[PDB]
Amino acid sequence: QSLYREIHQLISFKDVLPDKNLLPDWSSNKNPCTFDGVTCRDDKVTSIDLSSKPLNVGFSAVSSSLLSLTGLESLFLSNSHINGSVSGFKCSASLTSLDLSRNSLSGPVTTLTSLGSCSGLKFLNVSSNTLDFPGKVSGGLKLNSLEVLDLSANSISGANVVGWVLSDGCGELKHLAISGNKISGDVDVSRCVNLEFLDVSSNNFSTGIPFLGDCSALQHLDISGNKLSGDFSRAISTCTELKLLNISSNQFVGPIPPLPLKSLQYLSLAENKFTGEIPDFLSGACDTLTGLDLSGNHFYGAVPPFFGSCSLLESLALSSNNFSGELPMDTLLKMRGLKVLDLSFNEFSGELPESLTNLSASLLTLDLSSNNFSGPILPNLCQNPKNTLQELYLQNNGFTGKIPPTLSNCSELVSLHLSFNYLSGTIPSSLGSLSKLRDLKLWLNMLEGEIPQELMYVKTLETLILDFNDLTGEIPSGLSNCTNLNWISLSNNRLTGEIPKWIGRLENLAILKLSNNSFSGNIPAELGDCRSLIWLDLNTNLFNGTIPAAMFKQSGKIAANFIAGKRYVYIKNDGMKKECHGAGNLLEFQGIRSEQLNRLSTRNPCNITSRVYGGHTSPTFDNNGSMMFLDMSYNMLSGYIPKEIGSMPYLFILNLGHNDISGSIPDEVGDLRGLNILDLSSNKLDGRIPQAMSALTMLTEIDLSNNNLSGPIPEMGQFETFPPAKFLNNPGLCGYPLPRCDPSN
Numbered sequence: 196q197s198l199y200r201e202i203h204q205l206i207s208f209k210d211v212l213p214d215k216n217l218l219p220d221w222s223s224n225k226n227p228c229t230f231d232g233v234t235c236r237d238d239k240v241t242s243i244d245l246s247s248k249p250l251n252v253g254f255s256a257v258s259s260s261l262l263s264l265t266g267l268e269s270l271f272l273s274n275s276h277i278n279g280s281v282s283g284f285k286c287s288a289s290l291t292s293l294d295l296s297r298n299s300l301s302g303p304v305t306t307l308t309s310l311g312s313c314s315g316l317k318f319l320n321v322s323s324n325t326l327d328f329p330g331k332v333s334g335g336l337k338l339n340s341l342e343v344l345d346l347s348a349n350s351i352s353g354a355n356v357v358g359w360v361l362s363d364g365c366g367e368l369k370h371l372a373i374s375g376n377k378i379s380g381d382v383d384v385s386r387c388v389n390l391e392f393l394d395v396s397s398n399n400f401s402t403g404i405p406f407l408g409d410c411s412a413l414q415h416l417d418i419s420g421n422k423l424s425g426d427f428s429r430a431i432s433t434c435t436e437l438k439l440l441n442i443s444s445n446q447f448v449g450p451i452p453p454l455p456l457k458s459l460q461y462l463s464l465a466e467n468k469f470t471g472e473i474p475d476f477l478s479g480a481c482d483t484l485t486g487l488d489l490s491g492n493h494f495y496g497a498v499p500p501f502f503g504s505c506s507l508l509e510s511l512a513l514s515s516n517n518f519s520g521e522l523p524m525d526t527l528l529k530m531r532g533l534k535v536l537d538l539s540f541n542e543f544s545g546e547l548p549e550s551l552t553n554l555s556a557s558l559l560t561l562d563l564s565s566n567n568f569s570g571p572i573l574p575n576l577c578q579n580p581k582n583t584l585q586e587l588y589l590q591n592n593g594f595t596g597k598i599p600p601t602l603s604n605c606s607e608l609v610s611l612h613l614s615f616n617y618l619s620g621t622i623p624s625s626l627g628s629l630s631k632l633r634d635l636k637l638w639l640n641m642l643e644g645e646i647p648q649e650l651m652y653v654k655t656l657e658t659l660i661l662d663f664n665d666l667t668g669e670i671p672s673g674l675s676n677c678t679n680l681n682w683i684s685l686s687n688n689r690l691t692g693e694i695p696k697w698i699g700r701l702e703n704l705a706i707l708k709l710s711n712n713s714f715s716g717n718i719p720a721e722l723g724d725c726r727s728l729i730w731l732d733l734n735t736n737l738f739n740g741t742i743p744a745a746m747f748k749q750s751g752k753i754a755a756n757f758i759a760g761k762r763y764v765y766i767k768n769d770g771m772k773k774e775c776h777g778a779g780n781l782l783e784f785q786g787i788r789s790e791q792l793n794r795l796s797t798r799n800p801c802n803i804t805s806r807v808y809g810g811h812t813s814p815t816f817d818n819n820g821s822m823m824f825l826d827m828s829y830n831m832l833s834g835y836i837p838k839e840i841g842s843m844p845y846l847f848i849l850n851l852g853h854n855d856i857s858g859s860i861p862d863e864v865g866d867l868r869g870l871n872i873l874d875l876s877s878n879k880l881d882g883r884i885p886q887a888m889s890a891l892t893m894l895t896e897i898d899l900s901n902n903n904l905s906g907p908i909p910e911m912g913q914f915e916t917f918p919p920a921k922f923l924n925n926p927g928l929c930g931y932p933l934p935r936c937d938p939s940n
């Protein structure tokens with residue numbers, strides 16, 4: 196191991212990097228031990244770590260230069276843009292750990308057999324690459340000295356790949372992870388007598404449960420995200436050291452089988468098809484449970500008192516079943532260290548007991564959404580000065596009375612969701628002292644009064660959802676201090692005044708929904724300063740003046756990352772009812788049941804049986820996008836449509852119906868290639884429909900009726916596919932589907 200070879204090898208590797216900007220301090224002028232990413236012991240290189248650097252070289256360059264360094268013990272190249280395939284090479288006997296995860300390695304997984312020349316190799320990570328397995332699986336990986344092997348998240352599809360991995364022996368193996376592939380067939384680790392960690396999740400297993408044999412060392416077993424059913428209980432009967440069992444997202448059925456494995460600390464049976472009331476399936480002492488998840492099955496009945504033995508439980512998840520009865524305090528109060536209580540989507544009922552306040556001392560998350568609780572929200576929920584509560588989810592129940600202003604004592608609160616209840620009174624101003632609050636959701640209640648100026652103190656505020664209350668007054672200027680606002684929804688209240696000019700300062704603002712209020716004045720040009728605005732719904736107000744060209748100036752520069760990943764529903768207007776306005780309502784929908792959407796019937800004249808679209812927000816671009824949804828219908832807008840309207844390639848819906856807009860449809864409307872819905876009806880538009888609109892190919896709905904348009908309807912494009920109704924009440928308009936233009940009228 197001469198310095199001469201060491202330095203020439205390191206530098207010869209640097210000299211083949213495409214980006215000259217890489218490894219700026221490696222030099223034949225410096226000692227290797229001074230290089231960034233190099234670790235030495237007694238002035239000799241022992242480890243190299245170039246992970247998260249865009250090397251952009253082939254594995255052969257890596258194996259030629261770095262893996263043959265005498266005395267090298269570890270090599271970390273995770274997320275280094277290494278591509279190509281591994282093949283035979285000379286490897287130093289000192290090398291114990293190789294991390295090649297998160298690259299673009301490709302070829303048959305049989306290529307990894309070449310690593311057999313690393314005689315000391317004990318740890319191999321090749322997760323997140325594109326390795327695969329031909330057709331028929333034969334021979335074996337033959338790396339039987341590995342203690343740790345991670346082949347996760349590759350492109351391995353095939354039956355019995357696991358046997359292939361283990362074929363030449365697995366006496367040394369402690370940790371095997373191969374999740375995130377498409378492997379099927381048998382898993383037999385019965386000869387892996389030292390195996391402590393097995394992860395075969397997110398694969399394609401649909402037959403036998405893994406055979407574990409003696410199961411003498413196993414502590415962690417994850418078979419989640421497959422299509423397994425059958426007798427998992429019998430398969431782990433011998434497992435005396437098991438601490439974590441994850442069988443969630445599979446096809447298991449029947450009642451919960453006994454699992455009195457006393458060592459068990461984490462257990463998930465979530466998203467299967469288990470049925471019944473909970474039988475006592477644990478030891479007298481609740482095994483050693485810190486974590487329990489029974490979510491997404493068909494359980495019903497009361498939460499059994501034997502759960503009172505789980506005094507170490509930190510996380511209890513029972514959501515999306517059919518549990519009933521009143522909150523089980525006697526049981527829950529025995530869980531002195533409970534951090535997460537998730538009972539959402541069940542049929543718990545009755546009022547909140549005062550003892551619930553004893554529980555909220557360790558509680559980070561209290562989730563009671565979508566049940567049948569009633570009575571008032573507890574006033575003293577956060578009495579204790581050492582309270583840690585971060586999430587309070589009470590939405591979609593039957594709570595009455597006021598929002599307790601003492602919720603301001605929940606100083607660590609991050610998300611407050613009280614939507615879908617029957618709360619009255621005002622939004623307490625003390626909420627402004629929640630210095631970590633990010634989400635304030637109170638929609639569909641009977642709240643009155645004004646939106647509190649004191650919200651200006653919540654610099655962390657990202658979501659403000661207040662639709663369907665009885666709020667009055669104007670948008671308070673204090674909101675301008677909430678510079679991280681992403682989603683503002685104030686629709687269906689009785690708010691007044693203007694859209695303030697400071698709205699343009701809100702650079703994170705993605706969704707602004709103000710529909711069905713009494714807002715007035717002009718549309719501010721400052722909306723064109725909002726860097727993230729993708730959804731603007733202003734329908735059914737009293738806005739007037741002309742649509743300002745500047746409001747479209749951010750087109751092509753829109754960012755849409757922050758808004759992503761949130762549950763919503765979109766309720767489409769079917770057009771059948773005159774009282775129902777706008778293209779459709781986009782609404783927040785975390786923890787609420789669609790079945791309860793009928794609760795809108797007293798607020799909303801729209802046929803509930805109208806189409807409900809749902810999911811998690813997912814913009815079509817990440818950056819350099821444009822507005823996606825613009826609805827300014829049922830106002831008193833006048834003047835002309837600016838040509839800038841056509842500058843939004845991601846605009847799916849444009850609704851300017853029922854205003855007093857005049858002049859003609861701009862040719863640039865034909866530039867809106869993503870357009871599905873164009874509603875310009877009940878205005879005063881004149882002139883011809885531009886032929887340029889023939890270029891639009893994605894239209895599913897158009898409406899130009901009730902204007903003063905004239906001349907022929909364009910022959911090309913989608914016009915001919917729409918009913919005459921979409922063009923009626925335009926005296927000068929002619930051509931299919933209208934009567935043919937006839938010069939002599």
Ligand SMILES: *[C@@H]1O[C@H](CO)[C@@H](O[C@@H]2O[C@H](CO)[C@@H](O[C@@H]3O[C@H](CO)[C@@H](O[C@@H]4O[C@H](CO)[C@@H](O)[C@H](O)[C@H]4NC(C)=O)[C@H](O)[C@H]3NC(C)=O)[C@H](O)[C@H]2NC(C)=O)[C@H](O)[C@H]1NC(C)=O
Nearest residue numbers: 687688710711712735774775776795796797798799800801
């Ligand atoms: C903007 O917001 C305002 C304020 O919310 C909103 O006005 C309200 O609209 C709703 C829906 O039209 C009205 O609903 C009242 O209450 C019920 C709703 O279920 C209805 O009465 C019965 O309804 C049931 C269910 O549909 C039906 O089976 C039954 O036949 C109805 N009873 C009758 C008359 O036979 C009525 O819709 C109505 N009831 C009353 C008070 O007669 C609210 O009354 C409205 N609240 C007001 C005006 O203060 C308005 O629509 C929103 N605007 C837009 C464009 O969305």
Ligand SMILES: *[C@@H]1O[C@H](CO)[C@@H](O[C@@H]2O[C@H](CO)[C@@H](O[C@@H]3O[C@H](CO)[C@@H](O)[C@H](O)[C@H]3NC(C)=O)[C@H](O)[C@H]2NC(C)=O)[C@H](O)[C@H]1NC(C)=O
Nearest residue numbers: 273294295296297319320321322323343344345348370372
């Ligand atoms: C093989 O390499 C994989 C890719 O690096 C490893 O998978 C990653 O392990 C990371 C370290 O545990 C995880 O770190 C995440 O982000 C931070 C890191 O400091 C943690 O706080 C987070 O808790 C953790 N994840 C989250 C958000 O909870 C990576 O998430 C994880 N996954 C990927 C695909 O990157 C394997 O661990 C490694 N195999 C072995 C056996 O070591």
Ligand SMILES: CC(C)[C@H](C)[C@@H](O)[C@H](O)[C@@H](C)[C@H]1CC[C@H]2[C@@H]3COC(=O)[C@H]4C[C@H](O)[C@H](O)C[C@]4(C)[C@H]3CC[C@]12C
Nearest residue numbers: 730763765767808811812813814815823847871872895
């Ligand atoms: C970017 C987010 C804010 C947004 C909620 C996003 O997650 C969501 O997928 C958006 C893009 C969806 C939600 C509802 C969708 C619309 C649902 O309403 C409809 O009228 C359909 C009719 C027809 O299927 C059209 O092809 C699309 C169209 C008109 C959809 C266009 C795309 C959406 C507007």
Ligand SMILES: *[C@@H]1O[C@H](CO)[C@@H](O[C@@H]2O[C@H](CO)[C@@H](O)[C@H](O)[C@H]2NC(C)=O)[C@H](O)[C@H]1NC(C)=O
Nearest residue numbers: 351352353354376377378379380398399400401
């Ligand atoms: C996951 O496994 C299933 C079940 O083995 C695969 O479906 C089979 O695929 C083979 C090969 O094309 C067919 O011959 C069988 O008829 C399929 N069986 C059934 C019941 O449909 C499926 O291909 C696998 N998924 C992936 C992504 O590899």
Ligand SMILES: *[C@@H]1O[C@H](CO)[C@@H](O[C@@H]2O[C@H](CO)[C@@H](O)[C@H](O)[C@H]2NC(C)=O)[C@H](O)[C@H]1NC(C)=O
Nearest residue numbers: 396397417419420441442443444461463466486
């Ligand atoms: C138990 O397994 C489930 C399901 O596989 C885990 O949840 C998934 O985690 C993976 C990443 O490993 C994600 O890709 C999935 O989106 C998750 N699915 C669901 C439905 O949440 C869960 O994390 C595991 N629990 C523990 C403690 O290990």
Ligand SMILES: *[C@@H]1O[C@H](CO)[C@@H](O[C@@H]2O[C@H](CO)[C@@H](O)[C@H](O)[C@H]2NC(C)=O)[C@H](O)[C@H]1NC(C)=O
Nearest residue numbers: 714715716717737738739740741831832833834
């Ligand atoms: C727009 O709504 C407002 C509030 O009712 C009104 O603002 C008037 O605008 C016109 C033209 O700018 C002028 O009469 C005055 O500048 C404003 N006077 C009032 C009443 O405040 C106006 O009625 C509406 N019309 C327009 C086109 O602005």
Ligand SMILES: *[C@@H]1O[C@H](CO)[C@@H](O)[C@H](O)[C@H]1NC(C)=O
Nearest residue numbers: 251252253277278279280301
């Ligand atoms: C590996 O990356 C380089 C650089 O982009 C490329 O030239 C080469 O073709 C890649 N190899 C494979 C097999 O894709």
Ligand SMILES: *[C@@H]1O[C@H](CO)[C@@H](O)[C@H](O)[C@H]1NC(C)=O
Nearest residue numbers: 495496516517518519520542
């Ligand atoms: C759910 O449980 C409740 C207990 O109150 C019962 O009345 C109801 O019929 C059950 N619903 C379903 C879908 O099984």
Ligand SMILES: *[C@@H]1O[C@H](CO)[C@@H](O)[C@H](O)[C@H]1NC(C)=O
Nearest residue numbers: 651652653672673675676677
């Ligand atoms: C909010 O906006 C301005 C600063 O630009 C000022 O009125 C005020 O000090 C800011 N912060 C608070 C807490 O009001």
